[PDB]
Amino acid sequence: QMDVELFPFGGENYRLDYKFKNFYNASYLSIKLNDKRELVRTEGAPQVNIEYSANITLNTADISQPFEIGLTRVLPSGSWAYAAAKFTVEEYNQYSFLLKLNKAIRLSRATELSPTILEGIVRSVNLQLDINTDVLGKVFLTKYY
Amino acid sequence: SMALSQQNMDIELSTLSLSNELLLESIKTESKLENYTKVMEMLSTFRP
């Protein structure tokens, strides 16, 4: 019923691209961050299949946890329609990214698993995205089952 | 209002499902109801 996209520019400056798949004749559009801080407030009902854009800023305290960007359209009758998405922003050095991309390609070619399915094996072991002997023990149990 | 996307061109779906949601949208705007459930509740008691 929508798709929302988050594109980065620099340290804190991000860009919020969104687009709605159905039309609700709303009074306004309130885009909030984890129900706490309001990012975007526009007037009138947004058009269907039109990609709108807005520049937002997120500090370090918002990136450290997977946050949620909620898009609610408030009708004149008082009721609303809520639609959200949960983002996860990771930050890597160019040397650190190419070494972790080296692990992700060589493990996916050997085990014939999808990189998203390999991400679920890593994330279930530890919080950080890294491969150790505990991850490789669960890649065996995944391929065996 | 229809997007000219790759998903609208490849993904097969029922013609009868496309015809119902066109009829559900027209009834929802004339009676000025809340959703498609209130359309089905209105048809459950509509006599004539």
mmCIF file of C-alpha atoms in Angstrom:
data_model
loop_
_atom_site.group_PDB
_atom_site.id
_atom_site.type_symbol
_atom_site.label_atom_id
_atom_site.label_comp_id
_atom_site.label_asym_id
_atom_site.label_seq_id
_atom_site.Cartn_x
_atom_site.Cartn_y
_atom_site.Cartn_z
ATOM 1 C CA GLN A 1 0.000 0.000 0.000
ATOM 2 C CA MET A 2 3.107 2.206 -0.141
ATOM 3 C CA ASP A 3 6.840 2.100 -0.562
ATOM 4 C CA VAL A 4 9.213 4.362 1.360
ATOM 5 C CA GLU A 5 12.927 4.822 0.677
ATOM 6 C CA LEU A 6 15.757 6.412 2.653
ATOM 7 C CA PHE A 7 18.784 7.764 0.793
ATOM 8 C CA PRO A 8 21.828 9.191 2.610
ATOM 9 C CA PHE A 9 23.801 12.319 1.740
ATOM 10 C CA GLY A 10 26.445 12.780 4.453
ATOM 11 C CA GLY A 11 26.857 12.393 8.188
ATOM 12 C CA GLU A 12 23.328 13.219 9.331
ATOM 13 C CA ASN A 13 21.597 14.478 6.166
ATOM 14 C CA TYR A 14 19.322 11.827 4.678
ATOM 15 C CA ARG A 15 16.588 11.938 2.041
ATOM 16 C CA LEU A 16 13.149 10.369 2.465
ATOM 17 C CA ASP A 17 11.446 9.191 -0.734
ATOM 18 C CA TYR A 18 7.925 7.803 -0.420
ATOM 19 C CA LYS A 19 5.009 6.911 -2.679
ATOM 20 C CA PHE A 20 1.469 5.740 -1.909
ATOM 21 C CA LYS A 21 -0.333 2.918 -3.712
ATOM 22 C CA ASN A 22 -3.899 3.932 -2.789
ATOM 23 C CA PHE A 23 -5.685 7.271 -2.445
ATOM 24 C CA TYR A 24 -7.242 8.326 0.863
ATOM 25 C CA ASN A 25 -8.664 11.867 0.874
ATOM 26 C CA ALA A 26 -6.690 12.969 3.925
ATOM 27 C CA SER A 27 -6.278 16.357 5.571
ATOM 28 C CA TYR A 28 -2.516 16.118 6.092
ATOM 29 C CA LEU A 29 0.416 13.702 6.111
ATOM 30 C CA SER A 30 2.414 13.263 9.322
ATOM 31 C CA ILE A 31 5.638 11.272 8.950
ATOM 32 C CA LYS A 32 7.109 10.482 12.364
ATOM 33 C CA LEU A 33 10.180 8.750 13.776
ATOM 34 C CA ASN A 34 9.396 5.920 16.253
ATOM 35 C CA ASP A 35 6.129 7.801 17.088
ATOM 36 C CA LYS A 36 8.302 10.435 18.865
ATOM 37 C CA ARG A 37 9.684 13.004 16.399
ATOM 38 C CA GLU A 38 7.729 14.322 13.421
ATOM 39 C CA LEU A 39 9.854 14.389 10.257
ATOM 40 C CA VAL A 40 7.511 15.555 7.472
ATOM 41 C CA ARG A 41 4.231 17.473 7.629
ATOM 42 C CA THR A 42 2.572 18.255 4.294
ATOM 43 C CA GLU A 43 -0.880 19.648 3.547
ATOM 44 C CA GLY A 44 -3.618 17.999 1.518
ATOM 45 C CA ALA A 45 -4.045 14.434 0.373
ATOM 46 C CA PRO A 46 -0.977 12.982 -1.383
ATOM 47 C CA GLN A 47 -1.527 11.696 -4.892
ATOM 48 C CA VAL A 48 -1.337 8.002 -5.705
ATOM 49 C CA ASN A 49 1.790 6.689 -7.513
ATOM 50 C CA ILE A 50 3.582 10.052 -7.169
ATOM 51 C CA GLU A 51 7.038 9.791 -5.593
ATOM 52 C CA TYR A 52 7.456 12.630 -3.101
ATOM 53 C CA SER A 53 10.773 13.634 -1.553
ATOM 54 C CA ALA A 54 11.886 15.293 1.677
ATOM 55 C CA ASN A 55 15.229 15.892 3.380
ATOM 56 C CA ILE A 56 15.475 14.600 6.955
ATOM 57 C CA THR A 57 18.266 14.419 9.532
ATOM 58 C CA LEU A 58 19.024 11.483 11.839
ATOM 59 C CA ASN A 59 21.644 11.679 14.590
ATOM 60 C CA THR A 60 23.810 8.894 16.037
ATOM 61 C CA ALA A 61 21.244 7.879 18.680
ATOM 62 C CA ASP A 62 18.679 6.971 16.003
ATOM 63 C CA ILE A 63 21.030 4.866 13.850
ATOM 64 C CA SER A 64 22.266 2.599 16.687
ATOM 65 C CA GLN A 65 18.908 0.752 16.863
ATOM 66 C CA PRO A 66 16.688 -0.354 13.965
ATOM 67 C CA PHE A 67 14.225 2.531 13.832
ATOM 68 C CA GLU A 68 10.738 2.802 12.356
ATOM 69 C CA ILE A 69 9.408 5.524 10.048
ATOM 70 C CA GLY A 70 5.615 5.722 10.173
ATOM 71 C CA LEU A 71 3.477 7.398 7.509
ATOM 72 C CA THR A 72 -0.060 8.226 8.644
ATOM 73 C CA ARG A 73 -2.722 9.997 6.572
ATOM 74 C CA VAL A 74 -5.354 11.681 8.743
ATOM 75 C CA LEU A 75 -8.831 11.950 7.231
ATOM 76 C CA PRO A 76 -11.088 14.958 7.978
ATOM 77 C CA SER A 77 -13.417 12.604 9.895
ATOM 78 C CA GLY A 78 -10.673 12.023 12.505
ATOM 79 C CA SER A 79 -9.697 8.480 11.543
ATOM 80 C CA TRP A 80 -6.308 7.746 10.008
ATOM 81 C CA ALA A 81 -4.448 5.123 7.987
ATOM 82 C CA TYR A 82 -1.073 4.006 9.340
ATOM 83 C CA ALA A 83 1.730 2.575 7.197
ATOM 84 C CA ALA A 84 5.317 2.144 8.341
ATOM 85 C CA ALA A 85 8.655 0.461 7.661
ATOM 86 C CA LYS A 86 11.634 -0.534 9.797
ATOM 87 C CA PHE A 87 15.068 0.589 8.593
ATOM 88 C CA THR A 88 18.556 -0.460 9.695
ATOM 89 C CA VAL A 89 21.472 1.828 8.815
ATOM 90 C CA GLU A 90 24.945 0.279 8.925
ATOM 91 C CA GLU A 91 28.166 2.226 8.398
ATOM 92 C CA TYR A 92 31.425 0.769 7.092
ATOM 93 C CA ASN A 93 34.899 1.773 6.016
ATOM 94 C CA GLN A 94 35.788 1.067 2.389
ATOM 95 C CA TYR A 95 38.409 -1.442 3.546
ATOM 96 C CA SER A 96 35.990 -3.001 6.047
ATOM 97 C CA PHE A 97 33.177 -3.287 3.495
ATOM 98 C CA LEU A 98 35.224 -5.078 0.825
ATOM 99 C CA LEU A 99 36.488 -7.603 3.385
ATOM 100 C CA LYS A 100 32.955 -8.332 4.609
ATOM 101 C CA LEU A 101 31.717 -8.499 1.017
ATOM 102 C CA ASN A 102 34.553 -10.991 0.483
ATOM 103 C CA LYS A 103 33.083 -13.236 3.194
ATOM 104 C CA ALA A 104 29.518 -12.912 1.898
ATOM 105 C CA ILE A 105 30.319 -13.932 -1.686
ATOM 106 C CA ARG A 106 32.642 -16.839 -0.855
ATOM 107 C CA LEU A 107 30.176 -18.304 1.647
ATOM 108 C CA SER A 108 27.218 -17.948 -0.726
ATOM 109 C CA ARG A 109 29.028 -19.667 -3.602
ATOM 110 C CA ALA A 110 30.172 -22.559 -1.412
ATOM 111 C CA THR A 111 26.933 -23.201 0.488
ATOM 112 C CA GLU A 112 24.543 -22.201 -2.374
ATOM 113 C CA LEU A 113 22.503 -20.056 0.038
ATOM 114 C CA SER A 114 20.960 -16.643 -0.515
ATOM 115 C CA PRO A 115 22.770 -13.639 1.028
ATOM 116 C CA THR A 116 19.607 -12.675 2.915
ATOM 117 C CA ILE A 117 19.361 -16.206 4.335
ATOM 118 C CA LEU A 118 23.049 -15.985 5.280
ATOM 119 C CA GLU A 119 22.254 -12.686 7.019
ATOM 120 C CA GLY A 120 19.613 -14.418 9.144
ATOM 121 C CA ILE A 121 22.200 -16.971 10.263
ATOM 122 C CA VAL A 122 24.661 -14.240 11.283
ATOM 123 C CA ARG A 123 22.107 -11.991 13.013
ATOM 124 C CA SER A 124 20.730 -14.875 15.100
ATOM 125 C CA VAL A 125 24.194 -15.562 16.545
ATOM 126 C CA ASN A 126 25.399 -12.071 17.459
ATOM 127 C CA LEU A 127 24.357 -8.445 17.076
ATOM 128 C CA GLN A 128 27.219 -7.395 14.798
ATOM 129 C CA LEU A 129 27.355 -8.668 11.223
ATOM 130 C CA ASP A 130 30.365 -10.999 11.340
ATOM 131 C CA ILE A 131 31.079 -14.663 10.617
ATOM 132 C CA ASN A 132 32.772 -16.904 13.188
ATOM 133 C CA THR A 133 32.837 -20.616 14.018
ATOM 134 C CA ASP A 134 29.420 -20.331 15.683
ATOM 135 C CA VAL A 135 27.860 -18.993 12.472
ATOM 136 C CA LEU A 136 29.430 -21.760 10.359
ATOM 137 C CA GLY A 137 28.034 -24.392 12.719
ATOM 138 C CA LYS A 138 24.538 -23.100 11.965
ATOM 139 C CA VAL A 139 25.174 -22.943 8.217
ATOM 140 C CA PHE A 140 25.759 -26.703 8.465
ATOM 141 C CA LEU A 141 22.522 -27.211 10.407
ATOM 142 C CA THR A 142 20.681 -25.046 7.873
ATOM 143 C CA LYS A 143 21.929 -27.067 4.893
ATOM 144 C CA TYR A 144 21.402 -30.361 6.718
ATOM 145 C CA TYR A 145 17.764 -29.668 7.618
ATOM 146 C CA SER B 1 -3.531 6.662 -11.777
ATOM 147 C CA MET B 2 -2.002 3.292 -12.683
ATOM 148 C CA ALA B 3 1.783 3.035 -12.472
ATOM 149 C CA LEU B 4 3.652 1.804 -15.556
ATOM 150 C CA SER B 5 5.840 -0.526 -13.517
ATOM 151 C CA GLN B 6 7.478 -3.877 -14.191
ATOM 152 C CA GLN B 7 5.243 -5.493 -11.558
ATOM 153 C CA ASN B 8 2.051 -4.341 -13.298
ATOM 154 C CA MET B 9 3.242 -5.912 -16.569
ATOM 155 C CA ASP B 10 4.609 -9.290 -15.453
ATOM 156 C CA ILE B 11 2.599 -10.366 -12.400
ATOM 157 C CA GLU B 12 -0.493 -12.334 -13.395
ATOM 158 C CA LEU B 13 -3.695 -11.905 -11.407
ATOM 159 C CA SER B 14 -7.354 -12.743 -11.893
ATOM 160 C CA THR B 15 -9.464 -10.590 -14.206
ATOM 161 C CA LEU B 16 -12.411 -11.187 -11.873
ATOM 162 C CA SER B 17 -10.354 -9.831 -8.970
ATOM 163 C CA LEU B 18 -9.653 -6.719 -11.052
ATOM 164 C CA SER B 19 -13.360 -6.419 -11.860
ATOM 165 C CA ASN B 20 -14.485 -6.743 -8.235
ATOM 166 C CA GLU B 21 -12.128 -4.080 -6.867
ATOM 167 C CA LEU B 22 -13.303 -1.709 -9.599
ATOM 168 C CA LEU B 23 -16.889 -2.365 -8.496
ATOM 169 C CA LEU B 24 -15.945 -2.151 -4.805
ATOM 170 C CA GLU B 25 -14.291 1.236 -5.357
ATOM 171 C CA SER B 26 -17.306 2.732 -7.146
ATOM 172 C CA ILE B 27 -19.752 1.616 -4.438
ATOM 173 C CA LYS B 28 -17.435 2.901 -1.682
ATOM 174 C CA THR B 29 -17.411 6.440 -3.127
ATOM 175 C CA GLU B 30 -21.147 6.771 -3.829
ATOM 176 C CA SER B 31 -22.377 5.494 -0.465
ATOM 177 C CA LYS B 32 -19.317 7.181 1.156
ATOM 178 C CA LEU B 33 -18.494 4.178 3.320
ATOM 179 C CA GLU B 34 -15.399 3.429 5.399
ATOM 180 C CA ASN B 35 -13.782 0.397 3.735
ATOM 181 C CA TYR B 36 -14.684 -2.694 1.713
ATOM 182 C CA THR B 37 -16.047 -4.408 4.834
ATOM 183 C CA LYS B 38 -18.710 -1.706 5.245
ATOM 184 C CA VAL B 39 -19.584 -2.272 1.579
ATOM 185 C CA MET B 40 -20.145 -5.979 2.270
ATOM 186 C CA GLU B 41 -22.139 -5.150 5.406
ATOM 187 C CA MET B 42 -24.361 -2.778 3.411
ATOM 188 C CA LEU B 43 -25.011 -5.409 0.728
ATOM 189 C CA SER B 44 -25.953 -7.946 3.409
ATOM 190 C CA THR B 45 -29.125 -6.007 4.328
ATOM 191 C CA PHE B 46 -29.896 -4.175 1.065
ATOM 192 C CA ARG B 47 -33.389 -5.269 -0.043
ATOM 193 C CA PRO B 48 -34.543 -3.937 -3.459
#
